[PDB]
Design a protein around this ligand. Structure first.
Ligand SMILES: *Cc1cc2c(cc1C)nc1c(=O)[nH]c(=O)nc-1n2C[C@H](O)[C@H](O)[C@H](O)COP(=O)(O)OP(=O)(O)OC[C@H]1O[C@@H](n2cnc3c(N)ncnc32)[C@H](O)[C@@H]1O
Ligand SMILES: *Cc1cc2c(cc1C)nc1c(=O)[nH]c(=O)nc-1n2C[C@H](O)[C@H](O)[C@H](O)COP(=O)(O)OP(=O)(O)OC[C@H]1O[C@@H](n2cnc3c(N)ncnc32)[C@H](O)[C@@H]1O
Ligand SMILES: CN[C@@H]1CCc2ccccc21
Ligand SMILES: CN[C@@H]1CCc2ccccc21
Lengths: 499, 494
């Protein structure tokens, strides 16, 4: 019934918020809709897989908050396999390579690729992480889709195709679905193109031994009966001295403050008294989550390694159900597996099939890409279609269609009376990720601590010491990468020398 | 507690569905979230205005279902004043005109304008009303915004500006916010550019004497205590023999079937057991409603008529809070008023101001456009910002951002077990309008009648006889309008 703070949602963000408040001496309750904590993280355990992350999994350098929280909870990481060669599969053929980026040999195509990534980061530098709507060209950039921007920037089909895959992979949405401003913000707030796309020295460097679900689970262990499972929140009433929070199973909770730690649009599942202010009322109808099926195919051995392939495949083309894979073999070298994502429209297209039908399509694809008949002999399969989840709405995160971030963005984490807003979507660094979940949950918690007069204003936002275990190498560029002209840039130089 | 059909939502669509089912002999209950019926229609009554529609108001030729339903309920229409000249205000200057379209005098600009409207209708002819995702170029058109399409088609800034206003007015959203496929469908399913934009012989021809709210009110009168006000639905359970519907005020309703007659996205406010299928689960997060403040400024007399202006103003430019007005004077000639819409981003921008501040801005604008100091002397003001409504989400209707209609459109009115879907968004003719609300409510009702084996399949969708009171004149084009080249077309010939 009565407490200091009700946290709506027991994902990483809600759990991090609850833990901070609990550690500060406040009485907290976490109201979680599902029969489990973890939300967009979910670690399945069975005999065949031991454990497998079916939701959020990867962590890496510069994600210091999630690393610190997990370490405190007694968790360890291991490195995703990137020892052997990566594969870029394009136009039905595989091209092995090393480094974060597939090599480009054609001089013109090379200039185009180089310019595209450079320009993405150039534009990102103009976008404040904590206020993307303050970018000098915010309106101009927000009013076009990523598709339009790619059409403008990419003078080769090769660059456009790879850029498209990049967008699909980063935000589980189509290039025509998302605002260019929002996407450029999203990449910049993850530290840029190299950081977001890299395994070694990037977002995909590591996984947690035993699964990421342990973060939420171990916080639940700490909080005991303060976490209430199968309590979907239906109603929040702020008309009286204490906030009243009602659940679907007819329980009433009374609190001084509330943290909403659910995906922004899932705020729609709550009836508000008094009604939300106009901007938030409409905002929460304008912010969908992406579409993805995460699929893990198990094999007797990590046979790709014997062919000097690490298991990473970047697979272009409409026919391919999966556009991106990583080796998901255990650190011990057993439970050999390939993780792949079925992205955006393909998640919707292929959801119609049976589990067995999807497994067959994936194996046949992997056999082709890896040039290996062994890929046709899986020993086990697990998958999760996040599009079907009532209490997630999708994965990985919320995307902003054209025009929305500038018009409604400022309200995303603006308190509504005594309701404060956590959730990865409200983070300013690695929003969309487990890292962003921690940042947002702890920030929301400290907003309440400040409201209670327990901490000064300048302690609401808190820096994080760099992990000693996962140090971050800086992102570097070469002289040629910095100064080589774009395709139209080269054409100008040809135009002027001819004149 | 127990009934045949629970209808969620007591707007026109829910009420029309409930009435049909009731008239067929079924026991119906309407669960309405608000303390009133009508939803996106709302007629305010007070001494100063007598009555005023603050939500949906206009009806016109080809909207035969709403006209028939209203007539049966004892309502009458009157004609919106369009006797005198319309005004197009552009680059700070007023240009009076007659007919539905503001004239263009520059020859190149004429070709560009002519081509734009023609092309909109040309494209629409390839879009099936009942299945826009089956258009031959559905994906190509769905993957671009209306902004991109206008940028492609309009060789003049004049055409682009007017086209932008047209989009803003029709769907209370920015050109860059909406799918081209969806917008082209929207116009086509209202009978095309001329029909949707016209007062005389179009969607804005008429209003209901006494207000459109009377439609929902009078059906509530018929249904008696079957309508439950302040019963927001929170939970629908289909795991057992009978469907269980729970409200926020802790009441339980048991039914054989349910009609969801709420805006698609407002389905999010209901927790479902079992969960919705994947496609609907995501669809209802991808379909926002537009943004609008409807504002009515009252005056001692309809003074604009004395200057041979009817009260219609089409006002271009960022500075103008209101881009479109109509005379809102009563048929009797009293309660003189100008109705104006604050559209899309301007609704969001100007919501910050006070009611009095908005009144001042509107009066000063109207004084400029009408060239009359009398506009500065209002006697009364009413307004409604639909963006603030928890149980509407916006107005007039739901828009589809790029990529959504093709990927999710087919699921909009697909039944989910024993839940059938009404609401204007699911109509195939005048979706977005009161007309569409009636079409969808009655169709959803008849889907259930068919499910019960009471009517054959071919009776689910039913034609509507043309109103004798509001006959439709056909939409015509001239030889030159049909065959004059576009700007690039002329450049080819050169
Ligand atoms: C789905 C997914 C996510 C993901 C990814 C791959 C997939 C398939 N890969 C990631 C990765 O490799 N590395 C990474 O850092 N992130 C990755 N992501 C995203 C990541 O999982 C999320 O960013 C993160 O988990 C989000 O955490 P957050 O706490 O902000 O949000 P949540 O997990 O969705 O938690 C919300 C909880 O609230 C409950 N809920 C929802 N509605 C209610 C109501 N009405 N009442 C009470 N509780 C509610 C949900 O059940 C959930 O537990
Ligand atoms: C807002 C608006 C609309 C409008 C317009 C101008 C404005 C400012 N001008 C119009 C016009 O001139 N001519 C015309 O034909 N239409 C015009 N529109 C649109 C028109 O008002 C709508 O198309 C029509 O009213 C829609 O009717 P429909 O029945 O489909 O939808 P609704 O009115 O929104 O009714 C829904 C009801 O459901 C209730 N609700 C919502 N959630 C719940 C829950 N969870 N439980 C129970 N009830 C719920 C709403 O309260 C509402 O009453
Ligand atoms: C949340 N991060 C997603 C999850 C996997 C991945 C891979 C490359 C870039 C981004 C991502
Ligand atoms: C719902 N119809 C809207 C409401 C008023 C109007 C005017 C022109 C075109 C469309 C519209």
């Amino acid at each position: 019934n009565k407490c200091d703070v009700v946290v709506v949602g027991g994902g990483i963000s809600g759990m991090a918020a609850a833990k901070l408040l609990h550690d500060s001496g406040l009485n907290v309750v976490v109201l979680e809709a599902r029969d489990r904590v973890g939300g967009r993280t979910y670690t399945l355990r069975n005999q065949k897989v031991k454990y497998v992350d079916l939701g959020g999994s990867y962590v890496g350098p510069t994600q210091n908050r999630i690393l610190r929280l997990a370490k405190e909870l007694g968790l360890e990481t291991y490195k995703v396999n990137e020892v052997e060669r990566l594969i870029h599969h394009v136009k039905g053929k595989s091209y092995p390579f090393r480094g974060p980026f597939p090599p480009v040999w054609n001089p013109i195509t090379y200039l185009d690729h180089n310019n595209f990534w450079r320009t993405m980061d150039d534009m990102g530098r103009e976008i404040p992480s904590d206020a993307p709507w303050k970018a000098p060209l915010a309106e101009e950039w927000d009013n076009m889709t990523m598709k339009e921007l790619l059409d403008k920037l990419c003078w080769t089909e090769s660059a456009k195709q790879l850029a498209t895959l990049f967008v699909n992979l980063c935000v589980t949405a189509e290039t025509h679905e998302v605002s260019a401003l929002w996407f450029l913000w999203y990449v910049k707030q993850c530290g840029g193109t190299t950081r977001i796309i890299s395994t070694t020295n990037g977002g995909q460097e590591r996984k947690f031994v035993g699964g990421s679900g342990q973060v939420s689970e171990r916080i639940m262990d700490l909080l005991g009966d303060r976490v209430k499972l199968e309590r979907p929140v239906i109603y929040i009433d702020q008309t009286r001295e204490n906030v009243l929070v009602e659940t679907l199973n007819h329980e009433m909770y009374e609190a001084k403050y509330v943290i909403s730690a659910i995906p922004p649009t899932l705020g729609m599942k709550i009836h508000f008294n008094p009604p939300l202010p106009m901007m938030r009322n409409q905002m929460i109808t304008r912010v969908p989550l992406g579409s993805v099926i995460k699929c893990i195919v198990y094999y007797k051995e990590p046979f790709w390694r014997k062919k000097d392939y690490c298991g990473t495949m970047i697979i272009d083309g409409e026919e391919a159900p999966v556009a991106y894979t990583l080796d998901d073999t255990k650190p011990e070298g057993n439970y050999a597996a390939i993780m792949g994502f079925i992205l955006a429209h393909k998640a919707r297209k292929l959801a119609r099939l049976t589990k067995e039908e999807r497994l067959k399509k994936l194996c046949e694809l992997y056999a082709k890409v890896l040039g290996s008949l062994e890929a046709l002999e899986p020993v086990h399969y697990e998958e999760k279609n996040w599009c079907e989840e009532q209490y997630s709405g999708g994965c990985y995160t919320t995307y902003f269609p054209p025009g929305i971030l500038t018009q409604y963005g400022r309200v995303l984490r603006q308190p509504v009376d005594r309701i404060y807003f956590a959730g990865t979507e409200t983070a300013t660094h690695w929003s969309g990720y487990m890292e962003g979940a921690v940042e947002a949950g702890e920030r929301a918690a400290r907003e309440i601590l400040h409201a209670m007069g327990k901490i000064p204003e300048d302690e609401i936002w808190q820096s994080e010491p760099e992990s000693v275990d996962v140090p971050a190498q800086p992102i570097t560029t070469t002289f040629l990468e910095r100064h080589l002209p774009s395709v139209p840039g080269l054409l100008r130089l040809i135009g002027l020398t001819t004149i």
